């Protein structure tokens, strides 16, 4: 649902709040799960965009 740029804003604010190292473990670690979801989710969308250009730019039949 969220745009690709809002994904980078979400990950940015997660990494910033975490790196200060001032949260409870059961909270900080539980949020670490979301971080890998956004990074894994965002990465996949760039797999689909990177491939579309190659098919569109190369002389595909």
């Amino acid at each position: 649902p969220a745009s690709f740029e809002k994904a980078l804003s979400e990950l940015e604010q997660i990494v910033t709040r975490l790196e200060s190292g001032d949260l409870p473990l059961e909270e900080a670690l539980n949020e670490f799960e979301r971080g890998v979801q956004l990074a894994r989710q965002g990465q996949a969308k760039l797999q689909q965009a990177e491939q579309r250009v190659q098919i569109l730019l190369s002389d595909n039949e």
Binding site: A49, E50, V53, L57
Partner: protein, 51 residues
């Protein structure tokens, strides 16, 4: 003395002059748009989102 050969001949030369006008006219116009469309496609390939 009144044969029409002389007037016929001028017409053939006169007609030829007009054909050369058409071809050099149209040939030159096509190259103008052949080159105009190349500049836009050159700019487009400069802006591809790959990077």
């Amino acid at each position: 003395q009144q044969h029409p050969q002389l007037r016929l001949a001028r017409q053939q030369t006169m007609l030829e002059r007009l054909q050369k006008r058409m071809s050099f006219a149209l040939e030159n116009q096509l190259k103008r748009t052949g080159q105009q469309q190349q500049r836009l496609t050159q700019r487009l390939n400069q802006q591809n989102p790959q990077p």
